[PDB]
């Protein structure tokens, strides 16, 4: 498909290739003190959510049809998404084998300089990162995916009929695709690690409040909005 | 003083079960199975912090000077302290060498009833409730150390100088108590104002938990606790 290529060819655009990758910050040991965590450390942490925020976007303003659904319900969806896509993207490029985070800038970390700002949650993540590489979700599989958990129904959009056709149109591509190189299943298998998304969604929620409690750096606002938003309260 | 300490200690005591009204009734150290926590967990857990809270204030009335305060800053004290001051009560209530979580009412609970509520929450207070056990606090040490959880500087105190004047007092009273049942006239003392801090860290484990809760949303919180929990959110 054309689509599928477009997809495709935001997804690729969207994350970094071995040479643009960045060992610039990377140490393969660090002794950190656990549990505890400084200024610098938050801000890293917030700097590469938001870092994050701003490629999830431009990703999302070349999915076919993306850009012209209404600018509210763009940005409720991006940011409906934005935690899920953050771990899932994260996770499908990391490399477990190694405690290697990769994030969308190129930045390497590793798991222990992970510790201080993400907590726990960062170890959560490299088990789910292992468990979807045991899928083998190709890259437009994953491609199709990944824009189907953006382009999905939330409450409050404006025009849910058109976020509800693009979500059709994204399914068939990827029905397709998933056809085409065979020669419901994976799929089935797929979802059945949703659950680990969702609770690693929450962790996620969990660790902004810690830090929002700890108040060491005030989170960015739109980070911030998102959290508050997510919470039925 | 002196007739402070006293009056500290008949606060206290009062405001507890005796070891003859404690309550066994419900106590099952053997709780076969998990796995994640259903919804009579996070009712128990609630109605557990709910019931101590009528306690404390009560307890709080009693403590000399406290019924001085303005009205408006008796409320914030009190709300600002209850998680710290429900985590101390049972760190020193409870029998943490056994796994025995007691509680104001005098219901006793096994450390496997309340793990599906209280998370990891729970195993904390333990080690907590361990450390402070090691200091061997005696009746009026503790009478004064947990009134002066309570009676300290909060943000948006009208008289914080005269908290500030009460804290003093009680402060006066337990330096002396310790000095003359220690040898006059500190390390124990300073060993014991040491657990102060620990108890906000607990205190935020505590929120943790709670927003977890409401996050999950199997039972809304009592309006009460709720409220505590989101005045004591900074935001
Ligand atoms: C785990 C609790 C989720 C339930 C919360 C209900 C609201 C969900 C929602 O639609 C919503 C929104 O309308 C705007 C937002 O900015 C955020 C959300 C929350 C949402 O997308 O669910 C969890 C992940 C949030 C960050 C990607």
Known sequence: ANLLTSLVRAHLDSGPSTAKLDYSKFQELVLPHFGKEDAGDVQQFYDLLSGSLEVIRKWAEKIPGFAELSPADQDLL????????????????????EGKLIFCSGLVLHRLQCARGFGDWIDSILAFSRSLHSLLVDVPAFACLSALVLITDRHGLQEPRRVEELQNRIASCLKEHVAAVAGASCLSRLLGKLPELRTLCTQGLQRIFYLKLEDLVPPPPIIDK???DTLPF
């Open 78 to 97: 991006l940011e409906s998404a934005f935690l899920e896509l953050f771990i899932l993207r994260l996770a499908y490029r990391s490399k477990p084998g």
């Open 226 to 228: 998102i959290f508050m």
